[PDB]
Symmetry: C2
Subunit: 296 residues, 2 copies
Protein backbone atom coordinates (compact mmCIF):
# COMPACT_ATOMS: atom_id res chain seq x y z
CA UNK A 1 0.00 0.00 0.00
CA UNK A 2 1.14 3.53 -0.81
CA UNK A 3 0.55 6.50 1.47
CA UNK A 4 0.71 8.90 -1.50
CA UNK A 5 0.09 8.48 -5.25
CA UNK A 6 3.23 7.77 -7.27
CA UNK A 7 3.68 9.89 -10.43
CA UNK A 8 3.57 8.16 -13.82
CA UNK A 9 6.95 6.69 -14.76
CA UNK A 10 8.22 6.55 -11.18
CA UNK A 11 8.68 3.57 -8.87
CA UNK A 12 8.05 3.34 -5.14
CA UNK A 13 10.72 1.06 -3.69
CA UNK A 14 12.83 0.20 -0.64
CA UNK A 15 16.53 -0.25 0.13
CA UNK A 16 18.18 -1.50 3.31
CA UNK A 17 20.85 0.92 4.47
CA UNK A 18 22.80 -0.03 7.60
CA UNK A 19 19.93 -2.27 8.68
CA UNK A 20 17.23 0.35 8.17
CA UNK A 21 14.62 -0.17 5.43
CA UNK A 22 14.28 3.17 3.61
CA UNK A 23 11.39 4.04 1.30
CA UNK A 24 11.90 6.18 -1.79
CA UNK A 25 10.27 7.12 -5.07
CA UNK A 26 12.55 7.14 -8.08
CA UNK A 27 12.39 7.90 -11.79
CA UNK A 28 14.13 9.48 -14.76
CA UNK A 29 17.51 9.09 -16.42
CA UNK A 30 20.85 10.83 -16.09
CA UNK A 31 22.91 12.11 -13.16
CA UNK A 32 21.28 11.64 -9.76
CA UNK A 33 19.37 14.31 -7.87
CA UNK A 34 18.19 13.47 -4.35
CA UNK A 35 15.23 15.46 -2.94
CA UNK A 36 14.83 15.46 0.84
CA UNK A 37 11.59 16.49 2.55
CA UNK A 38 11.08 17.86 6.07
CA UNK A 39 8.65 17.86 9.00
CA UNK A 40 4.92 17.30 8.50
CA UNK A 41 5.63 15.91 5.04
CA UNK A 42 7.08 13.05 3.05
CA UNK A 43 8.67 12.40 -0.34
CA UNK A 44 5.31 13.50 -1.73
CA UNK A 45 6.01 17.22 -1.29
CA UNK A 46 8.32 16.83 -4.31
CA UNK A 47 5.72 15.15 -6.54
CA UNK A 48 5.25 18.22 -8.76
CA UNK A 49 8.98 18.84 -9.24
CA UNK A 50 9.88 15.20 -9.86
CA UNK A 51 8.32 14.72 -13.33
CA UNK A 52 9.98 17.83 -14.78
CA UNK A 53 13.34 17.06 -13.18
CA UNK A 54 13.14 13.46 -14.39
CA UNK A 55 13.38 14.76 -17.96
CA UNK A 56 17.07 15.55 -17.39
CA UNK A 57 18.05 13.64 -14.22
CA UNK A 58 17.57 10.40 -12.34
CA UNK A 59 15.45 11.61 -9.44
CA UNK A 60 15.15 9.98 -6.02
CA UNK A 61 13.03 11.21 -3.13
CA UNK A 62 13.43 9.20 0.10
CA UNK A 63 11.25 9.27 3.18
CA UNK A 64 13.33 10.42 6.18
CA UNK A 65 13.93 7.59 8.68
CA UNK A 66 10.84 6.96 10.79
CA UNK A 67 8.68 9.10 8.50
CA UNK A 68 6.56 8.24 5.50
CA UNK A 69 7.23 4.57 4.85
CA UNK A 70 10.85 4.50 6.06
CA UNK A 71 11.90 2.60 9.18
CA UNK A 72 13.20 4.58 12.14
CA UNK A 73 16.98 5.01 12.36
CA UNK A 74 18.82 2.43 14.44
CA UNK A 75 21.57 4.86 15.43
CA UNK A 76 19.80 8.11 16.35
CA UNK A 77 18.07 11.24 15.08
CA UNK A 78 20.98 13.72 15.15
CA UNK A 79 21.95 15.31 11.81
CA UNK A 80 25.19 13.40 11.63
CA UNK A 81 23.52 10.06 12.30
CA UNK A 82 20.64 10.51 9.88
CA UNK A 83 22.83 11.95 7.14
CA UNK A 84 24.75 8.65 6.97
CA UNK A 85 21.62 6.80 5.81
CA UNK A 86 20.84 9.46 3.20
CA UNK A 87 24.45 9.53 1.94
CA UNK A 88 24.72 5.75 1.59
CA UNK A 89 21.30 5.58 -0.07
CA UNK A 90 22.42 8.10 -2.69
CA UNK A 91 25.68 6.26 -3.27
CA UNK A 92 23.83 3.01 -3.93
CA UNK A 93 22.44 4.73 -7.04
CA UNK A 94 25.31 7.06 -7.92
CA UNK A 95 28.52 5.25 -6.89
CA UNK A 96 30.69 6.65 -9.68
CA UNK A 97 29.57 10.26 -10.02
CA UNK A 98 28.75 13.06 -7.60
CA UNK A 99 25.03 13.71 -7.21
CA UNK A 100 22.91 16.81 -6.69
CA UNK A 101 21.07 17.47 -3.44
CA UNK A 102 17.90 19.46 -2.86
CA UNK A 103 16.58 19.77 0.71
CA UNK A 104 13.72 21.51 2.52
CA UNK A 105 12.91 22.11 6.20
CA UNK A 106 14.57 19.47 8.45
CA UNK A 107 15.81 17.85 5.25
CA UNK A 108 18.59 20.42 5.67
CA UNK A 109 19.38 19.23 9.21
CA UNK A 110 19.57 15.65 8.01
CA UNK A 111 21.83 16.29 5.04
CA UNK A 112 24.31 19.04 5.92
CA UNK A 113 26.79 16.78 7.73
CA UNK A 114 27.05 14.33 4.84
CA UNK A 115 27.48 17.24 2.42
CA UNK A 116 30.32 18.90 4.34
CA UNK A 117 31.96 15.53 5.04
CA UNK A 118 31.72 14.19 1.47
CA UNK A 119 32.10 17.25 -0.73
CA UNK A 120 33.52 15.31 -3.68
CA UNK A 121 30.20 13.41 -3.75
CA UNK A 122 28.02 16.53 -4.08
CA UNK A 123 27.90 18.24 -7.46
CA UNK A 124 25.37 20.99 -6.70
CA UNK A 125 23.39 21.90 -3.59
CA UNK A 126 19.96 23.49 -3.18
CA UNK A 127 18.75 24.38 0.32
CA UNK A 128 15.39 25.93 1.09
CA UNK A 129 13.42 27.11 4.15
CA UNK A 130 15.33 25.99 7.25
CA UNK A 131 18.32 27.09 9.29
CA UNK A 132 21.36 24.89 9.26
CA UNK A 133 21.48 23.96 12.97
CA UNK A 134 23.94 26.37 14.61
CA UNK A 135 24.02 29.03 17.34
CA UNK A 136 21.87 31.30 15.16
CA UNK A 137 18.77 29.34 16.16
CA UNK A 138 19.21 30.43 19.77
CA UNK A 139 18.43 34.03 18.69
CA UNK A 140 14.96 33.34 17.27
CA UNK A 141 12.27 34.98 19.43
CA UNK A 142 9.81 32.92 21.46
CA UNK A 143 6.97 35.41 20.83
CA UNK A 144 6.29 38.31 18.46
CA UNK A 145 4.21 41.50 18.53
CA UNK A 146 1.96 39.68 16.00
CA UNK A 147 1.47 36.47 18.00
CA UNK A 148 2.98 33.04 17.21
CA UNK A 149 6.68 33.15 16.30
CA UNK A 150 8.25 31.03 13.55
CA UNK A 151 10.07 28.55 15.77
CA UNK A 152 8.39 28.20 19.17
CA UNK A 153 7.60 24.66 18.02
CA UNK A 154 11.31 23.85 18.45
CA UNK A 155 10.74 23.83 22.22
CA UNK A 156 7.33 22.15 22.04
CA UNK A 157 8.70 19.29 19.93
CA UNK A 158 11.97 19.02 21.91
CA UNK A 159 10.22 18.87 25.30
CA UNK A 160 10.51 15.60 27.24
CA UNK A 161 7.70 13.50 28.79
CA UNK A 162 6.67 12.89 25.17
CA UNK A 163 4.84 16.20 25.53
CA UNK A 164 4.12 16.64 21.82
CA UNK A 165 3.05 13.03 21.09
CA UNK A 166 0.82 12.99 24.14
CA UNK A 167 -0.98 16.24 23.30
CA UNK A 168 -1.14 15.64 19.54
CA UNK A 169 -2.18 11.98 19.48
CA UNK A 170 -5.80 11.70 18.32
CA UNK A 171 -5.62 15.22 16.93
CA UNK A 172 -2.95 14.84 14.27
CA UNK A 173 -5.18 16.07 11.47
CA UNK A 174 -6.19 19.18 13.44
CA UNK A 175 -2.65 19.96 14.57
CA UNK A 176 -1.07 19.49 11.16
CA UNK A 177 -3.58 21.78 9.45
CA UNK A 178 -2.91 24.50 12.02
CA UNK A 179 0.86 24.02 11.87
CA UNK A 180 1.13 23.96 8.08
CA UNK A 181 -1.30 26.82 7.38
CA UNK A 182 0.13 29.08 10.11
CA UNK A 183 3.51 28.91 8.33
CA UNK A 184 1.97 29.41 4.87
CA UNK A 185 1.21 32.46 2.73
CA UNK A 186 -0.80 30.42 0.28
CA UNK A 187 -3.02 28.34 2.53
CA UNK A 188 -5.40 27.30 -0.24
CA UNK A 189 -2.93 24.86 -1.86
CA UNK A 190 -3.47 22.69 1.19
CA UNK A 191 -6.75 20.99 0.34
CA UNK A 192 -8.60 18.79 2.81
CA UNK A 193 -7.49 15.77 0.77
CA UNK A 194 -3.82 16.77 0.86
CA UNK A 195 -3.90 17.41 4.61
CA UNK A 196 -5.73 14.10 5.07
CA UNK A 197 -2.87 12.23 3.36
CA UNK A 198 -0.12 13.95 5.32
CA UNK A 199 -1.93 13.57 8.64
CA UNK A 200 -2.56 9.85 8.13
CA UNK A 201 1.15 9.31 7.47
CA UNK A 202 2.60 11.19 10.40
CA UNK A 203 -0.14 9.87 12.69
CA UNK A 204 1.45 6.41 12.62
CA UNK A 205 2.68 6.20 16.22
CA UNK A 206 6.30 5.49 15.25
CA UNK A 207 6.16 8.38 12.78
CA UNK A 208 4.64 10.86 15.23
CA UNK A 209 7.43 10.01 17.66
CA UNK A 210 10.08 10.04 14.94
CA UNK A 211 8.91 13.54 13.94
CA UNK A 212 9.71 14.97 17.34
CA UNK A 213 12.91 12.98 17.94
CA UNK A 214 14.51 15.11 15.20
CA UNK A 215 13.86 18.13 17.45
CA UNK A 216 14.95 16.34 20.63
CA UNK A 217 18.27 15.84 18.86
CA UNK A 218 18.56 19.44 17.62
CA UNK A 219 21.01 20.69 20.28
CA UNK A 220 23.18 17.66 19.58
CA UNK A 221 23.01 18.52 15.89
CA UNK A 222 24.08 22.09 16.70
CA UNK A 223 27.06 20.79 18.69
CA UNK A 224 27.97 18.41 15.84
CA UNK A 225 27.79 21.22 13.30
CA UNK A 226 29.98 23.52 15.38
CA UNK A 227 32.84 21.17 14.51
CA UNK A 228 31.80 20.33 10.95
CA UNK A 229 31.50 23.97 9.89
CA UNK A 230 35.24 24.48 10.28
CA UNK A 231 35.28 23.26 6.67
CA UNK A 232 33.48 25.48 4.16
CA UNK A 233 31.28 24.13 1.38
CA UNK A 234 32.90 24.48 -2.04
CA UNK A 235 30.24 23.20 -4.46
CA UNK A 236 27.85 25.55 -6.29
CA UNK A 237 24.95 26.26 -3.96
CA UNK A 238 21.55 27.92 -4.25
CA UNK A 239 19.25 28.94 -1.42
CA UNK A 240 15.50 29.60 -1.65
CA UNK A 241 13.28 31.21 0.96
CA UNK A 242 9.72 32.50 1.07
CA UNK A 243 9.26 36.26 1.36
CA UNK A 244 5.68 36.04 2.59
CA UNK A 245 4.11 35.17 5.92
CA UNK A 246 5.79 32.07 7.34
CA UNK A 247 8.98 32.21 5.26
CA UNK A 248 12.64 32.70 6.29
CA UNK A 249 13.27 35.75 4.10
CA UNK A 250 16.86 36.98 3.89
CA UNK A 251 17.98 34.65 6.70
CA UNK A 252 18.41 31.64 4.40
CA UNK A 253 20.97 33.26 2.08
CA UNK A 254 22.64 35.26 4.84
CA UNK A 255 23.32 32.13 6.90
CA UNK A 256 24.45 30.10 3.91
CA UNK A 257 27.03 32.79 3.06
CA UNK A 258 28.87 31.76 6.24
CA UNK A 259 28.91 28.12 5.09
CA UNK A 260 29.44 28.26 1.32
CA UNK A 261 32.02 29.92 -0.93
CA UNK A 262 29.81 29.84 -4.02
CA UNK A 263 26.18 30.61 -3.23
CA UNK A 264 23.36 32.48 -4.90
CA UNK A 265 19.99 33.04 -3.27
CA UNK A 266 16.40 33.95 -4.02
CA UNK A 267 13.56 35.18 -1.87
CA UNK A 268 10.11 34.46 -3.35
CA UNK A 269 7.53 37.18 -2.64
CA UNK A 270 4.04 35.91 -1.81
CA UNK A 271 5.34 32.53 -0.63
CA UNK A 272 5.68 31.18 2.90
CA UNK A 273 7.50 28.17 4.33
CA UNK A 274 6.14 25.38 2.14
CA UNK A 275 7.79 26.37 -1.16
CA UNK A 276 7.21 23.21 -3.22
CA UNK A 277 3.43 23.44 -2.64
CA UNK A 278 2.82 27.13 -2.12
CA UNK A 279 4.93 28.24 -5.06
CA UNK A 280 5.59 25.21 -7.20
CA UNK A 281 5.99 26.89 -10.60
CA UNK A 282 8.71 29.43 -9.75
CA UNK A 283 10.40 27.13 -7.23
CA UNK A 284 10.52 24.31 -9.79
CA UNK A 285 11.90 26.72 -12.42
CA UNK A 286 14.71 28.01 -10.21
CA UNK A 287 15.75 24.54 -9.12
CA UNK A 288 15.64 23.09 -12.61
CA UNK A 289 17.63 25.96 -14.11
CA UNK A 290 20.21 25.91 -11.33
CA UNK A 291 20.80 22.16 -11.57
CA UNK A 292 20.72 22.24 -15.37
CA UNK A 293 23.80 24.49 -15.41
CA UNK A 294 25.69 21.23 -14.84
CA UNK A 295 25.93 18.14 -17.04
CA UNK A 296 22.62 16.30 -17.57
CA UNK B 1 -17.74 23.59 47.58
CA UNK B 2 -14.06 24.48 47.87
CA UNK B 3 -11.48 23.41 45.30
CA UNK B 4 -8.70 23.82 47.91
CA UNK B 5 -8.56 23.53 51.74
CA UNK B 6 -9.06 26.90 53.43
CA UNK B 7 -6.51 27.53 56.19
CA UNK B 8 -7.85 27.50 59.75
CA UNK B 9 -9.25 30.93 60.63
CA UNK B 10 -9.75 31.96 57.02
CA UNK B 11 -13.01 32.27 55.12
CA UNK B 12 -13.72 31.46 51.50
CA UNK B 13 -16.15 34.02 50.08
CA UNK B 14 -17.23 35.83 46.93
CA UNK B 15 -17.60 39.45 45.89
CA UNK B 16 -19.42 40.74 42.81
CA UNK B 17 -17.26 43.36 41.11
CA UNK B 18 -18.51 45.06 37.94
CA UNK B 19 -20.83 42.13 37.22
CA UNK B 20 -18.16 39.48 37.85
CA UNK B 21 -18.23 37.16 40.87
CA UNK B 22 -14.68 36.88 42.25
CA UNK B 23 -13.72 34.17 44.71
CA UNK B 24 -11.23 35.01 47.45
CA UNK B 25 -9.92 33.69 50.75
CA UNK B 26 -9.57 36.19 53.58
CA UNK B 27 -8.22 36.17 57.13
CA UNK B 28 -6.33 38.13 59.77
CA UNK B 29 -6.43 41.71 61.03
CA UNK B 30 -4.68 44.99 60.29
CA UNK B 31 -3.75 46.76 57.05
CA UNK B 32 -4.79 44.90 53.88
CA UNK B 33 -2.41 42.77 51.83
CA UNK B 34 -3.68 41.29 48.56
CA UNK B 35 -1.84 38.25 47.14
CA UNK B 36 -2.37 37.49 43.45
CA UNK B 37 -1.51 34.08 41.95
CA UNK B 38 -0.60 33.31 38.33
CA UNK B 39 -0.97 30.64 35.63
CA UNK B 40 -1.48 26.99 36.48
CA UNK B 41 -2.51 27.93 39.99
CA UNK B 42 -5.06 29.67 42.23
CA UNK B 43 -5.22 31.51 45.57
CA UNK B 44 -3.95 28.25 47.06
CA UNK B 45 -0.32 28.86 46.12
CA UNK B 46 -0.32 31.42 48.97
CA UNK B 47 -1.78 29.05 51.57
CA UNK B 48 1.49 28.60 53.50
CA UNK B 49 2.31 32.32 53.53
CA UNK B 50 -1.23 33.44 54.48
CA UNK B 51 -1.40 32.33 58.15
CA UNK B 52 1.91 34.06 58.86
CA UNK B 53 0.88 37.35 57.24
CA UNK B 54 -2.52 37.21 58.91
CA UNK B 55 -0.77 37.63 62.25
CA UNK B 56 0.08 41.19 61.17
CA UNK B 57 -2.27 41.97 58.26
CA UNK B 58 -5.73 41.42 56.86
CA UNK B 59 -4.89 39.03 54.02
CA UNK B 60 -6.96 38.53 50.89
CA UNK B 61 -6.10 36.10 48.11
CA UNK B 62 -8.44 36.22 45.11
CA UNK B 63 -8.75 33.83 42.19
CA UNK B 64 -7.99 35.59 38.90
CA UNK B 65 -11.07 36.05 36.71
CA UNK B 66 -11.95 32.74 35.03
CA UNK B 67 -9.47 30.80 37.15
CA UNK B 68 -10.06 28.93 40.40
CA UNK B 69 -13.60 29.75 41.54
CA UNK B 70 -13.84 33.24 39.95
CA UNK B 71 -16.08 34.03 36.97
CA UNK B 72 -14.41 35.10 33.70
CA UNK B 73 -14.05 38.84 33.12
CA UNK B 74 -16.86 40.57 31.25
CA UNK B 75 -14.63 43.24 29.68
CA UNK B 76 -11.50 41.39 28.59
CA UNK B 77 -8.28 39.70 29.64
CA UNK B 78 -5.76 42.49 29.02
CA UNK B 79 -3.82 43.64 32.07
CA UNK B 80 -5.59 46.98 32.24
CA UNK B 81 -9.05 45.39 32.08
CA UNK B 82 -8.37 42.70 34.66
CA UNK B 83 -6.60 45.12 36.98
CA UNK B 84 -9.84 47.04 37.40
CA UNK B 85 -11.50 44.01 39.00
CA UNK B 86 -8.62 43.41 41.39
CA UNK B 87 -8.23 47.10 42.37
CA UNK B 88 -11.95 47.48 43.06
CA UNK B 89 -11.98 44.24 45.06
CA UNK B 90 -9.08 45.36 47.21
CA UNK B 91 -10.70 48.76 47.69
CA UNK B 92 -13.95 47.23 49.02
CA UNK B 93 -11.90 45.94 51.95
CA UNK B 94 -9.59 48.96 52.23
CA UNK B 95 -11.58 52.00 51.05
CA UNK B 96 -9.79 54.61 53.21
CA UNK B 97 -6.21 53.33 53.42
CA UNK B 98 -3.57 52.09 50.97
CA UNK B 99 -2.99 48.34 50.79
CA UNK B 100 0.02 46.12 50.04
CA UNK B 101 0.28 43.97 46.91
CA UNK B 102 2.11 40.69 46.31
CA UNK B 103 1.85 39.17 42.83
CA UNK B 104 3.40 36.16 41.09
CA UNK B 105 3.54 35.16 37.44
CA UNK B 106 0.61 36.57 35.43
CA UNK B 107 -0.62 38.12 38.68
CA UNK B 108 1.93 40.80 37.73
CA UNK B 109 0.37 41.36 34.29
CA UNK B 110 -3.02 41.67 35.94
CA UNK B 111 -1.99 44.18 38.62
CA UNK B 112 0.65 46.46 37.13
CA UNK B 113 -1.88 48.81 35.45
CA UNK B 114 -3.90 49.34 38.64
CA UNK B 115 -0.69 50.01 40.56
CA UNK B 116 0.59 52.64 38.14
CA UNK B 117 -2.83 54.27 37.76
CA UNK B 118 -3.57 54.37 41.51
CA UNK B 119 -0.18 54.82 43.16
CA UNK B 120 -1.61 56.36 46.33
CA UNK B 121 -3.64 53.17 46.95
CA UNK B 122 -0.54 50.96 47.03
CA UNK B 123 1.65 51.18 50.16
CA UNK B 124 4.22 48.53 49.30
CA UNK B 125 4.64 46.17 46.35
CA UNK B 126 6.23 42.73 45.90
CA UNK B 127 6.54 41.22 42.41
CA UNK B 128 7.97 37.78 41.72
CA UNK B 129 8.72 35.55 38.77
CA UNK B 130 7.30 37.22 35.65
CA UNK B 131 8.14 40.02 33.25
CA UNK B 132 5.88 43.04 33.22
CA UNK B 133 4.46 42.96 29.69
CA UNK B 134 6.63 45.23 27.51
CA UNK B 135 9.03 45.10 24.54
CA UNK B 136 11.52 42.95 26.49
CA UNK B 137 9.28 39.89 26.08
CA UNK B 138 9.97 39.92 22.32
CA UNK B 139 13.66 39.28 23.02
CA UNK B 140 13.31 36.00 24.96
CA UNK B 141 14.62 33.04 22.87
CA UNK B 142 12.33 30.39 21.39
CA UNK B 143 14.90 27.65 21.96
CA UNK B 144 17.94 27.38 24.23
CA UNK B 145 21.23 25.48 24.07
CA UNK B 146 20.86 24.24 27.64
CA UNK B 147 17.71 23.70 29.69
CA UNK B 148 14.56 25.06 28.03
CA UNK B 149 13.17 28.31 26.67
CA UNK B 150 11.38 30.16 29.48
CA UNK B 151 8.52 31.61 27.45
CA UNK B 152 7.90 29.52 24.33
CA UNK B 153 4.51 28.76 25.86
CA UNK B 154 3.52 32.40 25.21
CA UNK B 155 3.20 31.52 21.51
CA UNK B 156 1.53 28.14 22.18
CA UNK B 157 -1.08 29.73 24.42
CA UNK B 158 -1.63 32.73 22.15
CA UNK B 159 -2.03 30.64 18.98
CA UNK B 160 -5.26 30.94 16.94
CA UNK B 161 -7.83 28.18 16.39
CA UNK B 162 -7.90 27.42 20.13
CA UNK B 163 -4.77 25.38 19.50
CA UNK B 164 -3.82 24.99 23.17
CA UNK B 165 -7.31 24.16 24.54
CA UNK B 166 -7.90 21.69 21.75
CA UNK B 167 -4.68 19.80 22.45
CA UNK B 168 -4.78 20.06 26.25
CA UNK B 169 -8.48 19.35 26.90
CA UNK B 170 -8.78 15.95 28.58
CA UNK B 171 -5.03 15.96 29.32
CA UNK B 172 -4.88 18.83 31.80
CA UNK B 173 -3.38 16.75 34.58
CA UNK B 174 -0.58 15.44 32.36
CA UNK B 175 0.08 18.88 30.88
CA UNK B 176 0.16 20.72 34.20
CA UNK B 177 2.62 18.29 35.79
CA UNK B 178 4.97 18.71 32.84
CA UNK B 179 4.54 22.48 32.70
CA UNK B 180 5.05 23.04 36.41
CA UNK B 181 7.94 20.61 36.92
CA UNK B 182 9.84 21.76 33.82
CA UNK B 183 9.85 25.29 35.27
CA UNK B 184 10.91 24.11 38.75
CA UNK B 185 14.26 23.58 40.46
CA UNK B 186 12.83 21.72 43.46
CA UNK B 187 10.40 19.46 41.58
CA UNK B 188 9.84 17.29 44.67
CA UNK B 189 7.32 19.69 46.27
CA UNK B 190 4.87 18.92 43.47
CA UNK B 191 3.38 15.69 44.78
CA UNK B 192 0.76 13.89 42.72
CA UNK B 193 -1.76 14.96 45.35
CA UNK B 194 -0.99 18.67 44.97
CA UNK B 195 -0.93 18.39 41.17
CA UNK B 196 -4.33 16.67 41.30
CA UNK B 197 -5.77 19.70 43.12
CA UNK B 198 -4.38 22.25 40.67
CA UNK B 199 -5.28 20.21 37.59
CA UNK B 200 -8.87 19.67 38.73
CA UNK B 201 -9.36 23.42 38.99
CA UNK B 202 -7.97 24.46 35.63
CA UNK B 203 -9.70 21.54 33.93
CA UNK B 204 -13.05 23.35 34.23
CA UNK B 205 -13.58 24.17 30.55
CA UNK B 206 -14.12 27.91 31.19
CA UNK B 207 -10.93 27.94 33.28
CA UNK B 208 -8.81 26.24 30.64
CA UNK B 209 -10.00 28.78 28.08
CA UNK B 210 -9.59 31.70 30.46
CA UNK B 211 -5.99 30.66 31.17
CA UNK B 212 -5.10 31.08 27.51
CA UNK B 213 -7.06 34.29 26.99
CA UNK B 214 -4.53 36.03 29.26
CA UNK B 215 -1.82 35.16 26.72
CA UNK B 216 -4.05 36.02 23.76
CA UNK B 217 -4.25 39.51 25.30
CA UNK B 218 -0.52 39.76 26.01
CA UNK B 219 0.29 41.98 23.00
CA UNK B 220 -2.59 44.27 23.95
CA UNK B 221 -1.15 44.41 27.49
CA UNK B 222 2.25 45.34 26.06
CA UNK B 223 0.67 48.19 24.11
CA UNK B 224 -1.21 49.40 27.20
CA UNK B 225 1.93 49.32 29.33
CA UNK B 226 3.92 51.35 26.79
CA UNK B 227 1.73 54.34 27.70
CA UNK B 228 1.42 53.56 31.41
CA UNK B 229 5.16 53.15 31.95
CA UNK B 230 5.74 56.84 31.20
CA UNK B 231 5.18 57.27 34.96
CA UNK B 232 7.54 55.47 37.36
CA UNK B 233 6.33 53.61 40.45
CA UNK B 234 7.15 55.62 43.57
CA UNK B 235 6.26 53.20 46.38
CA UNK B 236 8.75 50.81 48.02
CA UNK B 237 8.99 47.68 45.91
CA UNK B 238 10.69 44.30 46.22
CA UNK B 239 11.32 41.73 43.48
CA UNK B 240 11.95 38.05 44.01
CA UNK B 241 13.15 35.59 41.38
CA UNK B 242 14.32 31.97 41.30
CA UNK B 243 18.04 31.52 40.65
CA UNK B 244 17.59 27.89 39.69
CA UNK B 245 16.11 25.96 36.78
CA UNK B 246 13.01 27.69 35.43
CA UNK B 247 13.58 30.99 37.26
CA UNK B 248 13.82 34.55 35.91
CA UNK B 249 17.17 35.14 37.62
CA UNK B 250 18.57 38.67 37.33
CA UNK B 251 15.99 39.72 34.72
CA UNK B 252 13.29 40.39 37.35
CA UNK B 253 15.19 43.11 39.18
CA UNK B 254 16.83 44.50 36.06
CA UNK B 255 13.45 45.14 34.41
CA UNK B 256 11.86 46.47 37.60
CA UNK B 257 14.58 49.13 37.82
CA UNK B 258 13.10 50.64 34.66
CA UNK B 259 9.69 50.81 36.36
CA UNK B 260 10.41 51.72 39.99
CA UNK B 261 12.34 54.46 41.78
CA UNK B 262 12.59 52.42 45.00
CA UNK B 263 13.30 48.72 44.41
CA UNK B 264 15.34 45.98 46.00
CA UNK B 265 15.70 42.56 44.45
CA UNK B 266 16.54 39.05 45.52
CA UNK B 267 17.44 35.97 43.53
CA UNK B 268 16.78 32.77 45.47
CA UNK B 269 19.36 30.04 44.80
CA UNK B 270 18.15 26.52 44.07
CA UNK B 271 14.65 27.83 43.37
CA UNK B 272 12.79 27.87 40.07
CA UNK B 273 9.61 29.60 38.97
CA UNK B 274 7.27 28.44 41.76
CA UNK B 275 8.76 30.28 44.73
CA UNK B 276 5.91 29.87 47.23
CA UNK B 277 6.06 26.06 46.99
CA UNK B 278 9.70 25.40 46.05
CA UNK B 279 11.26 27.73 48.57
CA UNK B 280 8.57 28.52 51.14
CA UNK B 281 10.86 29.33 54.07
CA UNK B 282 13.11 31.96 52.49
CA UNK B 283 10.36 33.39 50.28
CA UNK B 284 7.90 33.78 53.14
CA UNK B 285 10.58 35.40 55.30
CA UNK B 286 11.56 37.91 52.63
CA UNK B 287 7.92 38.86 52.04
CA UNK B 288 6.91 39.15 55.71
CA UNK B 289 10.03 41.17 56.52
CA UNK B 290 9.53 43.59 53.63
CA UNK B 291 5.85 44.20 54.35
CA UNK B 292 6.51 44.52 58.07
CA UNK B 293 8.67 47.61 57.51
CA UNK B 294 5.34 49.38 57.03
CA UNK B 295 2.56 49.78 59.59
CA UNK B 296 1.09 46.44 60.70
CA UNK B 297 -0.92 44.81 63.48
Amino acid sequence: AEEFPVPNGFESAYREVDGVKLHYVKGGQGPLVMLVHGFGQTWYEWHQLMPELAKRFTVIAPDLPGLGQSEPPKTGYSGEQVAVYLHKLARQFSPDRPFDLVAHDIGIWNTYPMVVKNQADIARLVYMEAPIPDARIYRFPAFTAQGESLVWHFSFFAADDRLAETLIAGKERFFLEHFIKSAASNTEVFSERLLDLYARSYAKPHSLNASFEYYRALNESVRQNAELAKTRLQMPTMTLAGGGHGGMGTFQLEQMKAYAEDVEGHVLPGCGHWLPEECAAPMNRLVIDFLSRGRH
